[PDB]
Symmetry: C3
Subunit: 334 residues, 3 copies
């Protein structure tokens, strides 16, 4: 009865984002996505700690979905019979029925199809929300992601100038609550159900054991470092479904930042550190001016260095000695 | 010596707000309020946990006081002889003498009358502040509320368009610190004085046992759900006197949000989640587009689902299938 | 090879700031600063608790450095042979090499000279960042400060009006993690190295034992209270290198606030409480309207009253009874 063109999207695993246009001359479409729920035991640190994860599409965070204002987003959610619990999905971008949660509850072996219209621009969290105490548990187990709703004319700086990014990365931050046993070692469990009681007691004390980007300590380092070149404008979309974060690009800045993540508001300029409110996504863009390694962290440094929340960028290009120079290398005090 | 008309206001218990005009053609007046302090033992959860509360007017939060810019606010504070401690009041809206705290200290059996001029627009916290370690203790025991200072021309969106609300609710969030005994059960006490030592040890660890709206788990649910109709513009004023909050309307948005709560600043538009800094009030307005149940939470979901911080709205009207529709109900995976 | 005038600055201990111009007709210069690292055991509370501090120039926070946009900042960092650890410096104001950290690592007995161009206006954190788990440890041990980069035309309100301050204070907030022994008393250590293991276990639980301004409970009270007069416009620069803060002037307001601390963005007006994101500095200006004592706190009141985070201002001048008056002094309830 809704007669618009349909467009399928192939989702990609974070931190990458599926191909999309920024400004577009296409009119509204129905954009179709499929998410499949996967419950699974995963390793979250280099010491081999395990965790009962629950995920959209097998990843933490779930994939970024990108559409334009006025599109209709049609999502098929699938809960395979290999899963043990009911799940649903709530989009913060959507209007009514608890963001879709009241219409998408599915047992193992079931699927559902929800359509919502993208009336509000920005980046938005989506997450599972099955009811009661299950809501935080599914979220901190990894069932969250984000959706970016672009203006049809693309991003602007609030003073009439277009802002175009050369690439976009999605960094999903996850607070994790892994109980310890009497000796002080992290416990492992055979099922999410068995993890539940001990995990809930710890959750209610509000202190995470780990805070990670892309699901694991070191996920966005080494071979999997983010990349750019001097002169490239990079958009970083950052979500946190449950707890605040304070992103910071070490050696860089946020040239244009939407910290509340909504493109109806002009961005702030020239930030050192920005703030992502728990239950929200934000976006920052930076044009790289210098080559080398940058670290992207939450600037609670204990969380960054000791609990897992650090990514790297490797940037290629030519060093600018006007911006920064070692005048005198380390030497003995005269 | 100040010769203006006087107007008495009858305060009402939150989440309701006393009757007031938005835009007004009245000039400045002296607006007169009375607050009576009540210390009392209250039940804060459905398991029957008790708490030594200290309150303005018998409620947590204290009532919302509404005036216009340039009014003089004259408050009579009364500390009846049935109370055991000295109290005072500090308004964040007021200028000088620690917001009035240095002029309003009263023992049981005493009253005081303070007048302050409302020179700054917005929503503002008020709270008891008797001195030293007593300050946090009285605040987290429930002695806080808010005052809304409207522009004489009412609210605007910062682009010259009037914003008028059809109704306003006041949601006061309270972090509570209830000690546990050796077995792990919540302790009960005979007086606020006796609760003091154990409560202070726990407070300094910074983790609340409960986080509640309107004084109790479930206070704004069931028969006491907030209400609206499709098409109504509702203002939600949210205060937190001690600890940050991240309000979120599940299934809705903040169409216009003053997250720092001050109407000299234009509102932000189209937010999913906003942030109320500890020691502040903010305000968000939303026009309901869909009927059904909405939940208003802090989007730390552990706090929302497990520690008490969830309210409901029941919205009447007609479902809009253009905004959202279940394309295919839950069914077996083909 | 860079041929500009050189200007030496003599740094002063916080909360004071070295002499500088707001608006200037000078062109770019190379401004030269020297920081000397001092590791030392210090007393942080009135009960005599000690702490293994690590500092720039012997103070917590390190001194505020003030320059103008387009200046080149040339810093000599000195790590004397009396220190035990390597140190470096990272400026959030600077571009490349992890803010300078990758170019400034020095062992005891060494110095280094870094130059960076001040391309972004605002207030910015600087801090030590030696690598890995050392990063949070050096920061929460006291190795942080701030640098203010002014526009050449001085500050403005975003509507074309100049904002000039009559004085500026720098308040550095420090979260400290002091372990307790079995009896429940704070432990003392002989070296930062020996403090490391116990301090790290406590840090990772994320709850500070103390939160202080200027290095010590009560540092900015009594004889060392901040001062102003009625009619004076005072700028307060506030930094927090690791953990969020929510500054509030009790009895006053923030007339003009840059809470993200960056002068490319217009200030917000008329705030009660503002928010400093961990890893950032912000700035607020207020014109005092009333004499007397004001307290400047973080409005987590437990932190303010019980953990150390309270400063005082003593303001001289004439009381304005129009703004506030005690109509009726405390008296028996009729
Ligand atoms: O960046 C958004 C900000 O820019 C303004 C102009 O100052 O409006 C621009 O962006 C709007 C939303 O994308 C466009 O609809 C408008 O046409 C464009 O000028 C502000 O209104 C807005 O807050
Ligand atoms: O919403 C406040 C915001 O709007 C502006 C206009 O952009 O001013 C409007 O609101 C002021 C405060 O209410 C009024 O005094 C003014 O007349 C009206 O245009 C901004 O100045 C202000 O930040
Ligand atoms: O306060 C900064 C804010 O003011 C505006 C004008 O609204 O620009 C002013 O400040 C700029 C940065 O200092 C100046 O370069 C400009 O000349 C001056 O009008 C905004 O553009 C800015 O966000
Ligand atoms: O070893 N169990 O707590
Ligand atoms: O039972 N008292 O801790
Ligand atoms: O007394 N040592 O924990
Ligand atoms: Cu789920
Ligand atoms: Cu949500
Ligand atoms: Cu009191
Ligand atoms: Cu206060
Ligand atoms: Cu160091
Ligand atoms: Cu840093």
């Amino acid at each position: 009865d809704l007669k618009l063109p349909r467009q399928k999207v192939e989702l990609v695993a974070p931190p990458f984002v599926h191909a999309h246009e920024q400004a577009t001359k296409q009119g509204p479409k129905i954009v179709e996505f499929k998410l499949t729920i996967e419950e699974k035991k995963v390793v979250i640190d280099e010491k081999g700690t395990t965790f009962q994860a629950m995920t959209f599409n097998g990843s933490m965070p779930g994939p970024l979905m990108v559409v334009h204002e006025g599109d209709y987003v049609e999502t098929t959610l699938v809960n395979p019979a290999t899963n043990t619990m009911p799940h649903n999905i709530d989009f913060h971008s959507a209007t009514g029925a608890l963001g879709g949660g009241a219409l998408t509850l599915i047992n193992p072996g079931e699927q559902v199809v929800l359509r919502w219209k993208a009336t509000k621009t920005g980046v938005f969290v989506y997450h599972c929300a099955p009811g009661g105490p299950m809501i935080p548990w599914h979220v901190v187990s990894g069932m969250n992601g984000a959706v970016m709703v672009l203006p049809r004319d693309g991003l602007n700086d609030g003073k009439g100038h277009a802002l175009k990014y050369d690439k976009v990365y999605y960094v999903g931050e996850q607070d994790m609550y892994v109980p310890r046993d009497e000796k002080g070692n992290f416990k492992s469990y055979d099922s999410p159900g068995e993890a539940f009681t001990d995990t809930e007691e710890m959750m209610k004390k509000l202190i995470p054991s780990h805070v990670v980007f892309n699901g694991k300590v070191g996920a966005l380092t080494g071979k999997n470092a983010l990349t750019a070149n001097v002169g490239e404008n990079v958009l970083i979309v950052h979500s946190q479904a449950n707890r605040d974060s304070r992103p910071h690009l070490i050696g860089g800045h946020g040239d244009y930042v939407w910290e509340t993540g909504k493109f109806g508001n002009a961005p702030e300029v020239g930030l050192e550190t920005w703030f992502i409110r728990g239950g929200s996504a934000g976006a920052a863009m930076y044009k790289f001016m210098q080559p080398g390694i940058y670290a992207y962290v939450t600037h609670n440094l204990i969380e960054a260095a000791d609990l897992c929340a650090t990514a790297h960028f490797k940037v290629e290009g030519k060093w600018n000695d006007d911006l920064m120079t070692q005048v005198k290398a380390p030497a003995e005090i005269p």
